[PDB]
From a paper:
In contrast to typical indole PTs that exhibit broad substrate specificities towards the prenyl acceptors but with strict specificities towards the prenyl donors, it is remarkable that the indolactam-specific TleC and [name] exhibited unusually relaxed substrate specificities towards the prenyl donors and accepted different chain lengths (from C5 to C25) of prenyl pyrophosphate in vitro.
To understand the intimate structural details of the enzyme reactions, we solved the X-ray crystal structures of TleC and [name] as the apo structures (at 2.0 and 1.6 Å resolutions, respectively) and the ternary complexes with (−)-indolactam V and a DMAPP analogue dimethylallyl S-thiophosphate (DMSPP) (at 2.1 and 1.4 Å resolutions, respectively). [name] is also quite similar to these enzymes, with RMSD values of 2.9, 3.0 and 2.8 Å, respectively. In contrast, the rotation of the corresponding Tyr80 was not observed in the [name] structures, because of the steric hindrance between Tyr80 and Met159. Moreover, the significant conformational differences of the loop between residues 166–174 in TleC and 152–160 in [name] (RMSD of 1.9 Å for the Cα atoms), and the lack of a residue between 157 and 159 in [name] (170 and 173 in TleC), result in the displacement of the Cα atom of the active site forming residue Met159 in [name] by 1.3 Å towards the inside of the active site, as compared with Ala173 in TleC.
Residue numbers in the entry: 2 to 339, 344 to 375
């Protein structure tokens, strides 16, 4: 049935979408905005301009077919960005060094319809299968599960491209557990994890969740589209009605768990005064041949009842206190948005022994009024 907290689907009087006047010129396309933003975001992070150009070339190659839609009077509200734009910029810090820059996109049809959009989203993967650095076999093996006869009205599939400092790009896909409806979501996930060779670990997680506050809504199944030992399967669990201590304890099922770290992050950012507008999410990672989740990353919502400026102040302060580059985070937010609540979540994984702390941001371009 779709995400209850972030709207997406056909634009109409019931789902209006209005361009902010002072952003891109009349006639500008989403791809125009994304290219400009991608460049400015690389610069704000001190990344090599050559790598930014490579990122732009890659985005045009893979998404240009669908992303050259007009910013003005869009026919579809996308899920990928909180303002409804069909692209979202993200920066990720894994310990020290230059941040990874990611863009996540949705491919819409002309005109945008559920069936058209699902066709486009899966046609994107066929195009991606021609790219030497992509491994699309594992996701195309799931197409019959996630691409039914009649998609639901709020269908989505999202595609990520990561630009890494001094390294080859990484590709990711995000799939909708609700593709065949809410009722079918558990069986769709069970079957997908079977096909991906991580059934035991998944069912182990299910059993664990049943005893630790419950498995809230599964928000997404994501795959790293690489043929490497680093590639993972990822499941995003949204935690309605759980307190911060319980979310922390729930993560103990995963390797690398650091008791107390999740609860502290939630207290420092989301706060304990007002429930957030949407619940936190834990992303559990899986690897074929490992019987438990290999990692857990917390997705932290911005605090309710507090201005966005304070949300950014808290998030930056939390970053600093983890030894990460908060200045880069603030610069990236400015570059990506051109005051406005355009963040999605902020992601955090504490450093396990021998490891590095991780923090990531996810920011809409602010093309549309909230």
């Amino acid at each position: 049935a779709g995400d209850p907290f972030v709207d997406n689907g056909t634009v109409s009087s019931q789902r209006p979408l209005r361009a902010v006047p002072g952003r891109y010129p009349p006639g500008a396309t989403h791809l125009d905005a994304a290219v400009d933003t991608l460049v400015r975001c690389h610069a704000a992070l001190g990344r090599a301009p050559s790598e930014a150009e490579a990122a732009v070339c890659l985005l045009r190659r893979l998404w240009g077919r669908w992303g050259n839609t007009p910013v003005e009077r869009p026919g579809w509200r996308s899920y990928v960005a909180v303002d409804g734009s069909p692209f979202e910029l993200s920066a990720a810090w894994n310990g020290d060094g230059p941040a990874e820059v990611r863009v996540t996109v949705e491919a819409t049809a002309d005109p945008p319809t559920p069936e058209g959009n699902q066709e486009a989203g899966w046609e994107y993967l066929r195009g991606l299968s021609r790219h030497p650095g992509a491994a699309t076999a594992r996701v195309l093996a799931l197409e019959d599960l996630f691409r039914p006869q009649t998609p639901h009205d709020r269908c989505w599939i999202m595609h990520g491209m990561a630009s890494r400092p001094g390294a080859d790009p990484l590709f990711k896909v995000y799939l909708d557990p609700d593709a065949r409806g809410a009722a079918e979501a558990p069986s769709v996930l069970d079957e997908a994890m079977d096909r991906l060779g991580v059934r035991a670990a998944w069912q182990g997680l299910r059993g664990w969740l049943d005893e630790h506050g419950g498995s809230g809504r599964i928000g997404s199944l994501a795959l790293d589209l690489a043929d490497t030992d680093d590639a993972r399967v990822k499941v995003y669990v949204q935690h309605a009605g759980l307190d911060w201590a319980d979310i922390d304890r729930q993560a103990a099922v995963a390797r690398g768990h650091v008791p107390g770290a999740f609860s502290a992050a939630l207290e420092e950012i989301t706060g304990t005064e007002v429930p957030p507008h949407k619940p936190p999410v834990t992303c559990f990672a899986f690897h074929r041949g490992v019987g438990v989740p290999t990692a857990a990353t917390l997705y932290i919502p911005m605090p309710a009842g507090v201005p966005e400026s304070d949300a950014r102040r808290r998030s930056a302060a939390f970053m600093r206190r983890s030894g990460l580059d908060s200045a880069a985070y603030l610069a990236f937010l400015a570059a990506a948005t051109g005051v406005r609540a355009l963040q999605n979540f902020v992601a955090y994984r504490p450093a396990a022994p021998g490891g590095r702390p991780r923090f990531a941001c996810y920011v809409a371009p602010g093309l549309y009024r909230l």
